[PDB]
Every structure is written in structure tokens, then in C-alpha cells.
């Protein structure tokens, strides 16, 4: 075995991240062990501000190009089964999943 696993869920789509995030809670609590539920980091807003205009002219209008990236993370304690079950299931959309070994 039982080691200090962190699962770091980073994705853009809040809804398609929190269907996965819920399935790891409900996937672990099925075969119960521990957790400390989903952590909510500040959402990072990737904000670009370019001119609307190609070339010069016209009254100066710009767009406000944004991309969000919310990070959840979920602590757990398990063997090399429950990790390799819970991570490989509940994948699919534009969702990145990290797996820390223990502590550091």
C-alpha cells in the first residue's frame, strides 16, 4: 503493498474532467482503501490579446483569446492493480492523467 499514490487530473473541459474525477472516487470507493477527495487548484487562464485586423487598419479592435485549464487531484493508497484499473478506465476525451509514486 500500500503506497502513497497521487492521481493528478489536468484537463480543459470541466464537465468531461469531473465525469472522470467522479469515476475515480466511485472506482476506488468500490474497492475501498482511502482517498482525500478531489482537490481544486486555481484554474489557469491562458489569455492572449491580439488585433482583430490582419494588416493595419480600422478602429483598433482586438479579440480576447482564452483557454482554461482546471486541475483536480486525488490522493489514494493502493497496490499496482487498483492504480492500473482506475487509471486505464475513465479515459477518453481531452484529459491528461498523471500518476505520482509516493510523497515526492
Amino acid at each position: 503493498a500500500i503506497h502513497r499514490i497521487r492521481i493528478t487530473l489536468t484537463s480543459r473541459n470541466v464537465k468531461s474532467l469531473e465525469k472522470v474525477c467522479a469515476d475515480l472516487i466511485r472506482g476506488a470507493k468500490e474497492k475501498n482503501l482511502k482517498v482525500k477527495g478531489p482537490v481544486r487548484m486555481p484554474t489557469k487562464t491562458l489569455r492572449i490579446t491580439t488585433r482583430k485586423t490582419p494588416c493595419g487598419e480600422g478602429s483598433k479592435t482586438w479579440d480576447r483569446f482564452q483557454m482554461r485549464i482546471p486541475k483536480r487531484l486525488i490522493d489514494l493508497h493502493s497496490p499496482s492493480e487498483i492504480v492500473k484499473q482506475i487509471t486505464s478506465i475513465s479515459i477518453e476525451p481531452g484529459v491528461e492523467v498523471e500518476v505520482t509514486i509516493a510523497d515526492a
Partner: protein, 227 residues
């Protein structure tokens, strides 16, 4: 390798890789009606579902073309031997995708045809397919030294709001001809408002559906019952 590229600078990169594909893919599987990839990253592997139409051409000689494109994507964005499998699939109801039809109109003109009869042939189709509405614009010089702009329209179309963003299927494609350059713009309206399966939101937020009294029979004298 031990870079760990940033959740800021990484999703940007995979957005970019996404874009870089969807262009060469568009620009090479054009005559075959590329609708779109949906990039499918996995363990040990990077699936990449090429959602196009006429799959007899993406395969080619016994499945050569698919194997070229796999090799290409191996040699470009850095995907080792057996770490990338393309997966060509046919588009469901190709009338309702925009760039499919917009390309079908780059090549219907390119082939040699009037604007008029062609774009109707498109516009006819996309409605008949099953659209809430649609429009096509063929800007550019059109049998005259001067530039015209032509716009043949049919059915319903919302032209503002967030709603637009997940409902219309916009698609611009040029067309390079023996003269010069026209623009296609296909802009279809999706009637997944009726039945996506669960059509996203479904309501255009304006639209409310009041389910009707259904029963509400009987005032009557009192009575009782037992069970």
C-alpha cells in the same frame, strides 16, 4: 524526457499538434471528404480517428495510403515505431457536416460546372439530408472582371449568441480555378435540437416545450377505494 512540459505550455502544444494535423489531413484527404480527426491518446500509443467519407481512397492499393500517413505522423510529431495507428472511419450522415459539403463544392466547381446548378445541388442535399436550415455563399469573381457575391439560403438559421457555437457547422474553403479564386462558405444549422440523442442543451434557449395536461379528468362526487 525529464522536461515534464507545462500544463500551460503542453495543452498549447497538443492544441498545436491537433491543428498541424487537421491541416495536412484536410489538404491531403480533401477529395475524399475529411470531416475531422479526433486525436485519441492512449497507453504506449496514440490513436487518431480520421473521420472522413469515401474510405476506398484512404486505403488505396490494399491499404497503402493509410500506411503512408501513419509513417508521416511517425516521422513528423515524434511517434516511435508502433506508437501511432491511424483509423479511417466513414462519417455518419455526411449531409450534416459542413467541410464535407464545402469541399464537395470546391471539387464540384473544380470539376467544371456553373455556380448555380452546383450549389443548389449541395443546398438541396444538405436540407434533404436532415437540416434545420443552411446557407451557402460563393463570393469572388464570377464570369466578369468584377467580383460578385452570391448567397442561396434555405430553412432556419441563428445568427448570434453562444448558441451559434455548438449548433451551426461553419466551414470556409477556397477554390482555385483556371481563372482566379472563389470562396465557399457552407454554414449548416443542426436540428439535433429535436433529437441529438440527448442533443446538446437541445433547446435553443428561446424555445420552451410545455408538456400538456395529459389527464386531469373527473371532478365527480367523492367516493373512496381500498387495496
Amino acid at each position: 524526457m525529464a522536461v515534464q512540459i507545462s500544463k500551460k505550455r503542453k495543452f498549447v502544444a497538443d492544441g498545436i499538434f491537433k491543428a498541424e494535423l487537421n491541416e495536412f489531413l484536410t489538404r491531403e484527404l480533401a477529395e475524399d471528404g475529411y470531416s475531422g480527426v479526433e486525436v485519441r491518446v492512449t497507453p504506449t500509443r496514440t490513436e487518431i480517428i480520421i473521420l472522413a467519407t469515401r474510405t476506398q481512397n484512404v486505403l488505396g492499393e490494399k491499404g497503402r495510403r493509410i500506411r503512408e500517413l501513419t509513417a508521416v505522423v511517425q516521422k513528423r510529431f515524434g511517434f516511435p515505431e508502433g506508437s501511432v495507428e491511424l483509423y479511417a472511419e466513414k462519417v455518419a450522415t455526411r449531409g450534416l457536416c459542413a467541410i464535407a459539403q464545402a469541399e464537395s463544392l470546391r471539387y464540384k466547381l473544380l470539376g467544371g460546372l456553373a455556380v448555380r446548378r452546383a450549389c443548389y445541388g449541395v443546398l438541396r442535399f444538405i436540407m434533404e439530408s436532415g437540416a434545420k436550415g443552411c446557407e451557402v455563399v460563393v463570393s469572388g469573381k464570377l464570369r466578369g472582371q468584377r467580383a460578385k457575391s452570391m448567397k442561396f439560403v434555405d430553412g432556419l438559421m441563428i445568427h448570434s449568441g453562444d448558441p451559434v457555437n455548438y449548433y451551426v457547422d461553419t466551414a470556409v474553403r477556397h477554390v482555385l480555378l483556371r481563372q482566379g479564386v472563389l470562396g465557399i462558405k457552407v454554414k449548416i444549422m443542426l436540428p439535433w435540437d429535436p433529437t441529438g440523442k440527448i442533443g446538446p442543451k437541445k433547446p435553443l434557449p428561446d424555445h420552451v416545450s410545455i408538456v400538456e395536461p395529459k389527464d386531469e379528468i373527473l371532478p365527480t362526487t367523492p367516493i373512496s377505494e381500498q387495496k
